[PDB]
Symmetry: C2
Subunit: 221 residues, 2 copies
Amino acid sequence: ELFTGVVPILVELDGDVNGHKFSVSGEGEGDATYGKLTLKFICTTGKLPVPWPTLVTTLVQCFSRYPDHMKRHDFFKSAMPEGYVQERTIFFKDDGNYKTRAEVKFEGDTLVNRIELKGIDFKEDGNILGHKLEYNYNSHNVYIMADKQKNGIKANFKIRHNIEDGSVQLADHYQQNTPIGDGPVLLPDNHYLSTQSALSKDPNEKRDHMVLLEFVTAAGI
Amino acid sequence: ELFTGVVPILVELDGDVNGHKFSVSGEGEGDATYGKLTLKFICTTGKLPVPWPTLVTTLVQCFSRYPDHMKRHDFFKSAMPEGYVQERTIFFKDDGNYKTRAEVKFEGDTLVNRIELKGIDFKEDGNILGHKLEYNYNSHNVYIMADKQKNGIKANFKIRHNIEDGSVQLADHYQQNTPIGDGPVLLPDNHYLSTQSALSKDPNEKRDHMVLLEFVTAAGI
């Protein structure tokens, strides 16, 4: 399996929110055998317009650990190596909305994720815009459902971003995944993904960035 | 400063809850310059009676990153290397209570934490006892207050443990810290600690354990 060893991963995300241009290149490693991911992200254009944590779900579920018995419901890796397209509608509570389409497929030996993030409605008084979210993250449950007609998968899970004043900024997700090829895929039984993410820094990096440690496991069935 | 480089850390915790004996030895590294800690914990007696995550706050705030301006309010490192005693009363919602006294001081070059955990009231139908908490963690705010008469510090913060059915198991903390010596200490201005913790596993370990990555930062003043 492509994921028996450790896999290199690169991330190209191009964003635009309320007209502000920005680009983030990510790179790292991910061991699927343990639902553990590792990545460094540079705001390649300069100064990230929107907070780093608010972009975490956009910056590869094909790296989660799917126990041996659930191995038949791992659609993400079913998709491989032709990849899968992931589209998302994110709703941050009482502020705007992110819209993202991504292409994550094998580009050689290095798993490549390519995103285009669009965003609108962001208030110049809101937590998102006025950088009020704390640099950290919590844990969540990402629920998946086999969209049978579309041969892909469906996801809807919610994220809570903490604001400097404890306040819990809510991020509703509307996630759709569809294979990129015709190599028959794996519709799965309803199950969820328990993620753990820790955003952090780098003493060495003088460039605007984010450092993220992810530990994900398929649990459910 | 003892914490300019990376510091070795060992942890001896001896527990007893509802009469069940158990022991966990922890060992790892911690870079204070970045509020980053790293530790591996073995249930040395065999099978951890109570869930691993429910013991995370018991298993070294002296490793958090205190920005340069807040450097005068770092009591934990003020305590060094004579250490500090930490006592805790933990209340897990609609179940029992953990009581812990610890000794964390420099034992050579390796920072040593020594805990004795006592617990009672744990229901044989409760989330704690019947292992219903998910293996992960969220992020929190640990609030500190200079107890002036006691020359120590005071803390009260709350933890939310997720249960397999999403349910949020609540853990009230009553934290008291007091210097172990007479080397004048640092009473601090009210401030908080933003922690990020990720529990994980080890393919290699056949012994009952927990793996934890912590990223902590003093923010507040």
